[PDB]
Design a protein around this ligand. Structure first.
Ligand SMILES: *CC(=O)Nc1ccc(/N=N/c2ccc(NC(=O)C*)c(S(=O)(=O)O)c2)cc1S(=O)(=O)O
Lengths: 16, 185
């Protein structure tokens, strides 16, 4: 669980 | 030029073990036994940009990171299938400039997740498959967005930015260029 989903998501925050 | 993506991975994994008190080279093989990329051919700026953007990624996921090792089941080489889960999303949902720093960031962490369980042997293995994934999958996309140099153009190392900004505040000017881009041989 997570990780795939989590880093996918949290990764779109590398800007703001 | 191309294999410089290796550096970007390696340099980060190196720093990752450094903040834990482990060594990359003690558990390495990447540039250890074979020479892929230089110590910083083009990458000197791109890896410098990469580590900063990577840091921006780390703290953000660090909340879950320490717990996630149970989820990924950080273990023998099949931890790349654990990191697969994530690199899978990571690629489909928007491979951008800063997005790629996430890949090499959690990859550098994937390293330590291995060393954590005292399996620091994954350290070199991960870095291999990380840079390779970049080589095969990411590099084309990167080039569509300009390249690694372009990444530092956008999100480059601001430490060095401020370093040169000091004298640039007075405006040095007087700098003309007869050069046209980076030439190759
Ligand atoms: C189990 C798991 O980890 N699941 C999961 C999935 C997704 C997220 N977070 N996604 C997400 C998406 C976008 C943002 N913000 C941005 O748009 C930049 C965030 S943020 O605001 O937290 O940075 C998060 C988390 C998790 S969780 O680890 O279970 O919480």
């Amino acid at each position: 669980g997570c990780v795939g989903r989590a880093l996918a998501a949290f990764g779109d925050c590398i800007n703001r | 030029m191309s294999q410089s993506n290796r550096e970007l991975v390696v340099d980060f994994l190196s720093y990752k073990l450094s903040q834990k008190g482990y060594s990359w080279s003690q558990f390495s093989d990447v540039e250890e036994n074979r020479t892929e990329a230089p110590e910083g051919t083009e990458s000197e700026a791109v890896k410098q940009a990469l580590r900063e953007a990577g840091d921006e990624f780390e703290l953000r996921y660090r909340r879950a990171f320490s717990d996630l090792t149970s989820q990924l089941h950080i273990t023998p080489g099949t931890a790349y299938q654990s990191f697969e889960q994530v690199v899978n999303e990571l690629f489909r949902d928007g491979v951008n400039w800063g997005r790629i720093v996430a890949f090499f960031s959690f990859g550098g962490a994937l390293c330590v997740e291995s060393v954590d369980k005292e399996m620091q042997v994954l350290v070199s293995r991960i870095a291999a498959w990380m840079a390779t994934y970049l080589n095969d999958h990411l590099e084309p996309w990167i080039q569509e967005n300009g390249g690694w140099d372009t990444f530092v153009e956008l999100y480059g190392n601001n430490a060095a930015a401020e370093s040169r900004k000091g004298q640039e505040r007075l405006e040095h000017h007087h700098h003309h260029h007869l050069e046209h881009h980076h030439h190759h041989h």
